[PDB]
Scaffold this motif. Structure first.
Motif, PDB file in Angstrom:
ATOM      1  N   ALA A  23       0.989 -35.197 -14.610  1.00  0.00           N
ATOM      2  CA  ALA A  23       0.977 -34.875 -13.347  1.00  0.00           C
ATOM      3  C   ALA A  23       2.387 -34.968 -12.576  1.00  0.00           C
ATOM      4  CB  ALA A  23      -0.301 -35.670 -12.619  1.00  0.00           C
ATOM      5  N   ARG A  27       3.959 -32.133 -10.479  1.00  0.00           N
ATOM      6  CA  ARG A  27       4.201 -32.015  -8.967  1.00  0.00           C
ATOM      7  C   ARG A  27       5.668 -32.308  -8.347  1.00  0.00           C
ATOM      8  NH1 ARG A  27       0.494 -35.921  -8.907  1.00  0.00           N
ATOM      9  NH2 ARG A  27       0.839 -37.926  -8.480  1.00  0.00           N
TER      10      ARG A  27
ATOM     11  N   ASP D  59      -3.991 -32.560  -5.846  1.00  0.00           N
ATOM     12  CA  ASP D  59      -3.578 -32.013  -6.958  1.00  0.00           C
ATOM     13  C   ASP D  59      -5.143 -31.445  -7.418  1.00  0.00           C
ATOM     14  OD1 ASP D  59      -1.391 -33.576  -6.912  1.00  0.00           O
ATOM     15  OD2 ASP D  59      -1.337 -34.038  -9.169  1.00  0.00           O
TER      16      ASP D  59
END
Ligand SMILES: [Mg+2]
Ligand SMILES: [Mg+2]
Ligand SMILES: [Mg+2]
Ligand SMILES: [Mg+2]
Ligand SMILES: [Mg+2]
Ligand SMILES: [Mg+2]
Ligand SMILES: [Mg+2]
Ligand SMILES: [Mg+2]
Ligand SMILES: [Mg+2]
Ligand SMILES: [Mg+2]
Ligand SMILES: [Mg+2]
Ligand SMILES: [Mg+2]
Ligand SMILES: [Mg+2]
Ligand SMILES: [Mg+2]
Ligand SMILES: [Mg+2]
Ligand SMILES: [Mg+2]
Ligand SMILES: [Mg+2]
Ligand SMILES: [Mg+2]
Ligand SMILES: [Mg+2]
Ligand SMILES: [Mg+2]
Ligand SMILES: [Mg+2]
Ligand SMILES: [Mg+2]
Ligand SMILES: [Mg+2]
Ligand SMILES: [Mg+2]
Ligand SMILES: [Mg+2]
Ligand SMILES: [Mg+2]
Ligand SMILES: [Mg+2]
Ligand SMILES: [Mg+2]
Ligand SMILES: [Mg+2]
Ligand SMILES: [Mg+2]
Ligand SMILES: [Mg+2]
Ligand SMILES: [Mg+2]
Ligand SMILES: [Mg+2]
Ligand SMILES: [Mg+2]
Ligand SMILES: [Mg+2]
Ligand SMILES: [Mg+2]
Ligand SMILES: [Mg+2]
Ligand SMILES: [Mg+2]
Ligand SMILES: [Mg+2]
Ligand SMILES: [Mg+2]
Ligand SMILES: [Mg+2]
Ligand SMILES: [Mg+2]
Ligand SMILES: [Mg+2]
Ligand SMILES: [Mg+2]
Ligand SMILES: [Mg+2]
Lengths: 149, 100, 271, 77
Positions: A23, A27, D59
């Motif tokens: 992740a 990001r 997310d």
RNA sequence: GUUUAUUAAAAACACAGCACUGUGCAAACACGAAAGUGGACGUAUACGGUGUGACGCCUGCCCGGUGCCGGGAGGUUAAU
């Protein structure tokens, strides 16, 4: 994470693959620079028809335009005639700004962030090979020359 | 005023600069009255032992008359300079010629 | 000089004065002076944080230049002055252009000597330089830890850093503690040793010499009652517990270094 | 205050039970961090103080979808 | 010099000096849920803590015990 990839990723990816990534990589790196996008139902549909057929090739020809950007300056050499000390040992270290400005003033129109320096900040007076990052694959080879006035 | 005999050694890669370095050290002394009696560049000569972990230093013998102000100013320029690997400065007993 | 005082009165007996005959006899340059009100060891909350400070002579702050921003401009030292706010003495430097600034006075310095600072300059006592330009194995002071900042290391009278080694971007320094600390090569360092080295040999002589220097009496834990300090009570000079602060932490051999982010910069700890 | 911008996770209180069940009052702080999120809508970074679980919500949803909910309550970012 | 305002002014406290010790600067440390303040617009000839208590002559033996400092293999060892 799924993450659909727009740009050609260095190691794992290769344009429009749904390879698993951590992740943080998504990001902090892949998303904000505009390299990949999260793949959640509606995005996959935007990539399926619109991007992959048209905009992938438009993103590809921009790499050829980036390859053309290197060919703006056919000379591939810059003679820096800055002020110097008593036989070698230059007055000040040539940063990225001076090289960027010297190249932009009469050569390739490239930004400062793309200009790399293999052999440090260049304090020794002489010939120095400098390489820019116009594209991830294709690198330039400009022959910089620091001359003592 | 007083006669001297400077013998300094220079780093191999900076042997290209030695023709230049001689022109500066000559310009310092010759401007202040006393002339240089002998110019003898020995060149890249092998070392008996390694100084500063290297071999083949570039020797330069000047032998010059000068006042005490200038010769000591020249002595300081050797220490504040990474090119010059060591040097020594002898006394008078008149000018000389030849020998190597 | 270091002049002992004659014993006409007890309290004078032991006094030793550092009588520097150069330090300007007159008022300082006002433009660089400003007020410096005493806190008395209290903070925002009005509570004694640091003990044993309070009183002393009123003293103004002289704006000393640690940064040395003037590049390639020669500057004559006008006169040496007494800084009350600092251990070292200061020098009223007059730049060629017009500006005047106070700097820490190095050892070999007098009124009339010239100083240059910046990138090139000369290798001579007082001249500020980047550590990359300064020779290896040379005495420096007023040393920066970060490039472009003021100047942290070696500012006290008689203090000096020695540059031990360097590998490109980093420079290894041996500080007066004995600590070998690695700093950045772009950092600046005023060459030579910090003046007023005789400072150390003064001996105050009396209690009141400390009190007009802005110090208050330090009461020993052992004297106090158990409620006040961990050392406490005992009917007639007892102890029998391990040396500690007023707040329980063991003094007298106890490593309180715990920064951890800067530990990479320390090559070797002091000994 | 130690409050997540996204979820609204505040610090709750509770006990600190020892092996002999000695209830001493404590408090559970949430895992807050001042993170910068790239918003693709307006081409910019947005600093939000969020809990670690908040980031997982950012997310899960879109940063724009979360910033839509943040603006609905009447907050800044 | 200070001290038990209102039964103790002293040999008590302090004191200059002495030492050990911590602290490399976003210092140690202190106040503070935190931000942030003092320390200090100071930077190891500086700063905090502990002891001792001008000056002169000195300051001996013990590291088993309790603490502290360093070592870092082996044993034992929590969450996971
Ligand atoms: Mg993870
Ligand atoms: Mg006056
Ligand atoms: Mg203040
Ligand atoms: Mg206030
Ligand atoms: Mg104190
Ligand atoms: Mg001493
Ligand atoms: Mg002392
Ligand atoms: Mg004391
Ligand atoms: Mg008592
Ligand atoms: Mg209590
Ligand atoms: Mg108290
Ligand atoms: Mg107690
Ligand atoms: Mg008692
Ligand atoms: Mg007793
Ligand atoms: Mg006993
Ligand atoms: Mg204990
Ligand atoms: Mg305790
Ligand atoms: Mg020790
Ligand atoms: Mg809650
Ligand atoms: Mg709540
Ligand atoms: Mg518990
Ligand atoms: Mg209860
Ligand atoms: Mg911020
Ligand atoms: Mg009183
Ligand atoms: Mg009274
Ligand atoms: Mg009474
Ligand atoms: Mg009463
Ligand atoms: Mg009475
Ligand atoms: Mg003594
Ligand atoms: Mg002492
Ligand atoms: Mg606390
Ligand atoms: Mg302050
Ligand atoms: Mg006593
Ligand atoms: Mg006594
Ligand atoms: Mg006694
Ligand atoms: Mg003795
Ligand atoms: Mg003893
Ligand atoms: Mg014995
Ligand atoms: Mg032992
Ligand atoms: Mg241990
Ligand atoms: Mg090992
Ligand atoms: Mg092990
Ligand atoms: Mg083991
Ligand atoms: Mg084991
Ligand atoms: Mg086990």
């Amino acid at each position: 994470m799924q993450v659909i990839l727009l740009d050609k990723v260095a190691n794992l990816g290769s344009l429009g693959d749904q390879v698993n990534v951590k992740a943080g990589y998504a990001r902090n790196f892949l998303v904000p620079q505009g390299k990949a996008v999260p793949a959640t139902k509606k995005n996959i549909e935007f990539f399926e028809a619109r991007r992959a057929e048209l905009e992938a090739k438009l993103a590809e020809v921009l790499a050829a335009a980036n390859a053309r950007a290197e060919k703006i300056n056919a000379l591939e050499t810059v003679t820096i005639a800055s002020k110097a000390g008593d036989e070698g040992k230059l007055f000040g270290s040539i940063g990225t700004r001076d090289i960027a400005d010297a190249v932009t003033a009469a050569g390739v129109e490239v930004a400062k962030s793309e200009v790399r320096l293999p052999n440090g900040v260049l304090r020794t007076t002489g010939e120095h090979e400098v390489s820019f990052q116009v594209h991830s694959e294709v690198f330039a080879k400009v022959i910089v020359n620091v001359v003592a006035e | 005023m007083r006669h001297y005999e400077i013998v300094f050694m220079v780093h191999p890669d900076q042997s290209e600069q030695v023709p230049g370095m001689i022109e500066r050290y000559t310009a310092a002394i010759t401007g202040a009255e006393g002339k240089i009696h002998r110019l003898e560049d020995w060149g890249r000569r092998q070392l008996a032992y390694p100084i500063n972990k290297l071999h083949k230093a570039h020797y330069v013998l000047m032998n010059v008359e000068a006042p005490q102000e200038v010769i000591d100013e020249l002595e300081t320029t050797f220490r504040f300079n990474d090119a010059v690997i060591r040097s020594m400065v002898m006394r008078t007993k008149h000018a000389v010629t030849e020998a190597s | 000089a270091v002049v002992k005082c004659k014993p006409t009165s007890p309290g004078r007996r032991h006094v030793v004065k550092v009588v520097n005959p150069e330090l300007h006899k007159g008022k300082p340059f006002a433009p660089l002076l400003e007020k410096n009100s005493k806190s008395g060891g209290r903070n925002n909350n009005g509570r004694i944080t640091t003990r044993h400070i309070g009183g002393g002579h009123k003293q103004a702050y002289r704006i000393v230049d640690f940064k040395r921003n003037k590049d390639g401009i020669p500057a004559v030292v006008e006169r040496l002055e007494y800084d009350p706010n600092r251990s070292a003495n200061i020098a009223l430097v007059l730049y060629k252009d017009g500006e005047r600034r106070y700097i820490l006075a190095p050892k070999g310095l007098k009124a009339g000597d010239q100083i240059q600072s910046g990138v090139d300059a000369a290798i001579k006592p007082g001249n500020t330089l980047p550590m990359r330009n300064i020779p290896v194995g040379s005495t420096v002071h007023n040393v920066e830890m970060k490039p472009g900042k003021g100047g942290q290391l070696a500012r006290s009278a008689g203090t000096y850093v020695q540059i031990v080694a360097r590998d490109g971007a980093y420079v290894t320094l041996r500080l007066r503690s004995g600590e070998m600390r690695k700093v950045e090569a772009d950092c600046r360092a005023t060459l030579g040793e910090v003046g007023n080295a005789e400072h150390m040999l003064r001996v105050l002589g009396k209690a009141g010499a400390a009190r007009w220097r802005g110090v208050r009496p330090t009461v020993r834990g052992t004297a106090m009652n158990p409620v006040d300090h961990p050392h406490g009570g005992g009917e007639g000079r007892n102890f029998g517990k391990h040396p500690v602060t007023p707040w329980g932490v063991q003094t007298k051999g106890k490593k309180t270094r715990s920064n951890k982010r800067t530990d990479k910069f320390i090559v070797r700890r002091r000994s | 205050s130690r409050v997540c911008q996204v979820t609204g996770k505040r610090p709750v209180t509770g006990n600190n039970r020892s092996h002999a069940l000695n209830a001493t009052k404590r408090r559970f702080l949430p895992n807050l961090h001042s993170h910068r999120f790239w918003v693709e809508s307006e081409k910019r970074f947005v600093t939000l103080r969020v809990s670690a679980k908040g980031m997982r919500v950012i997310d899960k949803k879109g940063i724009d979808t979360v910033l839509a909910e943040l603006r609905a309550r009447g907050e800044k970012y």
